A and B are shown apart, each in its own frame.
Chain A
Amino acid sequence: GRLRGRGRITEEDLKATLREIRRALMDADVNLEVTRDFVERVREEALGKQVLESLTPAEVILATVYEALKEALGGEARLPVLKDRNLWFLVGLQGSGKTTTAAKLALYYKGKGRRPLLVAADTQRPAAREQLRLLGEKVGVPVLEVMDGESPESIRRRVEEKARLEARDLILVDTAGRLQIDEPLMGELARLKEVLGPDEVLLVLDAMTGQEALSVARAFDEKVGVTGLVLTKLDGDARGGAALSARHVTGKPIYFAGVSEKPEGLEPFYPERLAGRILGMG
């Protein structure tokens, strides 16, 4: 398993190496089923490829793995395309980082000349509205707080009025955290979506999320139609395999990376960098 260009990749080389790759992906928290598909994808791509002069069979397979991973994660950075009017939803599991991400997005775009409006739609978590209200003050962006029991139609009414009177062109709706299997709440999210009509629905996923990332992404996507993702808490040391799991089942772009607890802690997501991270290059 350590010789220079003296043969094409054999099925015997793609059994010893990919077994280690499968383990690395699992340790990185990439979902099991996603890992088998990825390994079998590499097996097909590498199957019987030439191992030039220089390069060992291992190196060629490792290169194939990294390239496949980079591609599966998005290839190159990609940010949302904004139009005259934009209304986005931040959705996801309890504690993923939605409220903070909404404030980060507001600051990021305000700096780009947009005029954002933050909408605190979480009325179940104690002090949730105060939380976004405070962040709004910190980033210098208006915050509309939904009232207890307010209907989707009423929310739409007030959001429309405020956006018009204050010339807002990017409305960020921060929703409460909910389990992807909570029928009542997932139904409420779907109804809010049909009434408000978001141009983007972003699933905020914690980088430390484990094997269930797959089911979580699929449920939110099938119930409310995810258009993109935000991977938070990347300033931690979690490998971030949940990102590949979410990408694999939704096919949607991972727009941003959350890299700190501060409002400025937002940046474009780079497939290349997470690929290395998942493989343990950092």
Chain B
Amino acid sequence: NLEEVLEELEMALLAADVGLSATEEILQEVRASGRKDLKEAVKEKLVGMLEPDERRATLRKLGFNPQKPKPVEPKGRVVLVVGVNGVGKTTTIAKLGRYYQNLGKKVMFCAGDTFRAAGGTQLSEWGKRLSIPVIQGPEGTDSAALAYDAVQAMKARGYDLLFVDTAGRLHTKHNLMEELKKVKRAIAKADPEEPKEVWLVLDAVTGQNGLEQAKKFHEAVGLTGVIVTKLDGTAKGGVLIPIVRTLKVPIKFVGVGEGPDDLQPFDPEAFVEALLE
């Protein structure tokens, strides 16, 4: 009965890329709760390992039900977007431009990827489609200098938000990770209080290596949020569970397509429902 359900649940979590460590910790806790209807206790538990801001979770526990959602808002004016090669950094920035421009914000982009072929022109094209200014330079230009110039332009023009794109880089390359830190330092040089947000982009199809990526980028630049892309596919993005549980970095948005509007604020409930099929 219950043992078959726990066995089923273990497979479902593993298939969702949650990992052995977190999967066992979840099942052990649910088994100890004495709850008859597992699955539901699991959903309740997971909707907890997907949100470190705490309070909203505590409220449902005390027999309350306060909500509002409220559009996600950057703490500051600069958002540094980081991540490994191919995850969706550039396209996510285009979507963030659309999302905030719809909220009346004046947005600007910095085509920080001066390393990869067409890395900057790709973002420039999105800016053109969205009528959003894009600061870019010839391939080979120093990313830090470009970011510095971007922040200066943003301040001089009175823009509300600046999204800094970065070239893809594997977390195992110390030199490229140092470059990322240099970019963050350049931003702070143009404005001492920035960047207030450093968001990691993760591909939903990623397996357990996603935890290592999150750990390394967090150690390098101090993440304040994560965006999971390609959730329109069959991958559930389960590696987020171990990530949020170990690093306590909040999930800001989910990417669900390749169009400018294919971005949605993270919804714990919906995400967990999908993860468990």
Q: A32-B15, A134-B117, A236-B172 are in contact. Are A208 and B125 (CB under 8 A)?
A: no
Collect the chain B residues with CB atoms within 8 Å of residue A138's CB.
Answer: 117
A241 vs B208: C-alpha distance in the bound complex, in angstroms?
10
Of A29, A95, A206, the residue contacting B208 (CB under 8 A) is A29
The answer to whether B247 has its CB under 8 Å from any CB of chain A is: no
Specify which of B16, B126, B232, B233 is in contact with A126 (CB 8 Å cutoff): B126
Q: Is B122 in contact with A237, judged by CB distance below 8 angstroms?
A: no
A236 & B117 in contact (Cβ 8 Å cutoff): no
A interface, how many residues as a size bin?
35 or more
Q: Which residues of A contact B235 (CB under 8 A)?
A: 210-212
Residues A237 and B117 in contact in the complex (CB < 8 Å), given A210-B235, A211-B15: no
| Nearest CB in chain A: distance from B17 CB, A | 4
B20 touches A215 (CB 8 A): no
Q: What 1/0 flags go to B227-248 for Cβ under 8 Å of A? A: 0001011110001000000000
Q: Are B209 and A238 in contact (CB under 8 A)?
A: yes
- Interface range for B: 35 or more
Residues of B near A10 (CB, < 8 A) are none
B170 lies within 8 A of chain A by Cβ: yes
Q: Are A209 and B258 in contact (CB under 8 A)?
A: no
Please pick, from A26, A135, A181, the residue contacting B234 in the complex, using a CB distance under 8 A. Answer: A181
B118 contacts A127, CB within 8 Å?
A: yes
Instruction: State the majority secondary structure of interface residues on B.
Output: loop
Chain B: which residue is nearest A129 at the CB level?
B118
- In the assembled complex, the CB of B137 is this many whole angstroms from the nearest CB of chain A, namely 15
A27 to B207, CA, bound (A): 9
Interface residues of A in 133-181 (CB under 8 A from B): 134-135, 138, 179-181
Q: Which of the candidate stretches B35-43, B83-91, B218-226 sits at the interface with the other chain? A: B83-91
Q: Is the beta-carbon distance between B230 and A236 smaller than 8 angstroms?
A: no
Contact: A26 with B86, CB < 8 Å? no
Q: Are B172 and A179 neighbours in the complex by a CB distance under 8 Å? A: no
Chain A CB within 8 A of B210 CB: yes
| Chain B residues, CB < 8 A from A233 | 84-86, 170
Shortest distance from the beta carbon of B141 to any chain A beta carbon, whole Å: 15
Q: A134 to chain B: which residues have CB within 8 Å? A: 117-118
B106 at the interface (CB under 8 A from A): no
Distance, CA A180 to CA B155, complexed state (A): 44
Contact in complex: A236, B171 (CB < 8 Å): yes
B264 contacts A by Cβ under 8 Å = no
B29 on interface, CB distance cutoff 8 Å = no
Given contacts A32-B11, A94-B230, A126-B122, contact A212 B170 (CB under 8 A): no
Give A1-36 interface residues, CB cut-off 8 Å to B.
Answer: 23, 26-29, 32
Does B203 sit at the interface, judged by CB under 8 A?
yes
Complex Cα–Cα for A261 and B86 (A): 11
Contact indicator A180/B234 (Cβ below 8 Å): yes
Q: What residues of chain B lie closer than 8 Å to A215, measured between beta carbons?
A: 234
Question: With a CB–CB cut-off of 8 A, which chain A residues contact B85?
Answer: 95, 97, 233, 261
Mark out the residues of chain B between 25 and 84 whose CB falls within 8 Å of any chain A CB in the assembled complex: 84
Q: Are B209 and A95 in contact (CB under 8 A)?
A: no
Knowing A32-B14, A211-B17, the reply to whether A97 touches B86 (Cβ < 8 A) is: yes
**Contact at B86–A96, with CB atoms within 8 Å?**
yes
Partner of A124, one of B86, B230, B258: B258
In this complex, the member of A26, A124, A208, A237 whose beta carbon has the largest number of chain B beta carbons within 10 angstroms is A208
Contact (Cβ within 8 A) A237 B208: no
Q: Tell whether, in the assembled complex, residue A235 and residue B170 are in contact, meaning their CB atoms are under 8 Å apart.
A: yes
Residues of B within 8 A of A (CB): 11, 14-17, 19-20, 84-88, 116-118, 121-122, 125-126, 129, 168, 170-172, 203, 205-210, 212, 230, 232-235, 239, 258
Which 3 pairs, one residue from A and one from B, show the smallest C-beta to C-beta distance? A210-B207, A95-B86, A29-B207
10 contacts between A and B (CB under 8 A): A95-B87, A126-B122, A127-B121, A134-B118, A138-B117, A208-B210, A210-B210, A235-B170, A237-B172, A241-B207
